[PDB]
């Protein structure tokens, strides 16, 4: 199954990732995805965000020094201990495939919840009508992902794909994803009952190509 | 003025032009997107259509053969003269200018109205917005397009360039035309008061690239 394949790999590379997230070894991040999402999130101004994927905690902390609460979830073991050793905030352990069928508490009526380059699995319909449930009405999803054109790689069409990490600094295991297309994106929010009200694609004013692709989705 | 010259252009490519559609040089319009355009039409099941720019008519042909009563519009007079010669239809002649000021009468309570691959200028809001005003309450815009990653040609940011028709049967003189990405695309449907209610990038199953960017947009 390589839906838990990708988990895994995720147990492999947690420690590869705290260090490469914090230590700022991943240049898109620090130019231009950070603030983007940021942005996207302060602008509806949230009292309460569900961080889904959360990882380490980079956003949960950036959203509390900003006045808000934010609520973390994350399906690794060794990224939620990081996220709640380096902050206030409340980290749940949960998979997608568990939050899918609402069967971990993570709390409820949050006005946004964010998935930051967390949403790289096959099959997540169920886990984003999940995520509606979990909004308030007129709550929002804010989804960051990679640009669908920008990792193409020749082939634009959804399936399965492996990251080997070359670029990044540490030692890693590849990690197999799921590539969707802009359309396929949009149907999945749709079938989720999310109605996607603002399209961003977050680029360097040097750079040539778009550094990711960046989506609000309303609950209705 | 790059949209004056684009329209010049077209005065002097229009023979070209209608060499090209109708003996069947674009391979790319038999092989996807004239299907593409018909289809997301006859979804729709209009009962009065304006096409935007219609050209030489083909759509117009394509539409009458269904039963659905098509108007066309466009700013070429040798397009609109070979429109009216191929077909019992109504076709004006109109800039974009003059429609979007609402000078020239084209008719008004259309269920829908379609642009393929005929809104290639620089200031579109305007335009978009007099065509909303054209719609009955739920009636749709269709727009097909250039898809703007396929096209990207590594610059992916808002500009005006420059077509040569290098690959085109026939002598052509080039064609200014501005290129604009999916964000700013959507933005130009919500500032002319449009919903994007759709989303496809038709593509052959053999491209590994979509042909194609096509929005359905809905009156409010
Ligand atoms: N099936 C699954 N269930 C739960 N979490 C998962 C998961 N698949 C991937 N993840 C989580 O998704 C994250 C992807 S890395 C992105 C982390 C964070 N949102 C950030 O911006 O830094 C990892 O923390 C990983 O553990
Ligand atoms: N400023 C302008 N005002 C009116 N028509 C214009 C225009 N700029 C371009 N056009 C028209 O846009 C068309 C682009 S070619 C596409 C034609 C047709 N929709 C088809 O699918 O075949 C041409 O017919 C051209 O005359």
């Not at 990490?165 to 295991?173: N, P, V, Y």
Request: charged share 20%; net charge negative.
């Amino acid at each position: 199954n390589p839906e838990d394949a990708l988990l895994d790999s995720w147990h492999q590379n947690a420690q590869a990732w705290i260090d490469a997230v914090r230590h700022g070894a991943i240049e898109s991040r620090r130019q231009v995805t950070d603030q983007a999402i940021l942005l996207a999130i302060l602008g509806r101004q949230p009292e309460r965000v569900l961080d889904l994927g959360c990882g380490e905690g980079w956003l949960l902390r950036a959203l509390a020094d900003r006045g808000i609460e934010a609520v973390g979830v994350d399906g690794d073991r060794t990224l939620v201990d990081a996220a709640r050793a380096a902050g206030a905030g409340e980290v749940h352990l949960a998979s997608y495939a568990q939050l899918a069928e609402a069967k971990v508490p993570v709390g409820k009526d949050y006005d946004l919840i964010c998935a930051n380059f967390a949403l790289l699995h096959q099959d997540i319909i169920e886990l984003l009508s999940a995520m509606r449930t979990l909004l308030v009405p007129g709550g929002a999803l804010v989804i960051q992902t990679l640009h669908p054109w920008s990792v193409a790689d020749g082939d634009y069409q959804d399936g399965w794909r492996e990251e080997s990490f070359a670029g990044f600094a540490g030692d890693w295991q590849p990690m197999p994803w799921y590539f969707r297309t802009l359309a396929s994106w949009l149907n999945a929010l749709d079938m989720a009952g999310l109605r996607l009200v603002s399209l961003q694609e977050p680029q360097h004013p040097q750079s040539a190509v778009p550094q990711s692709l960046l989506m609000v989705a309303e609950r209705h």
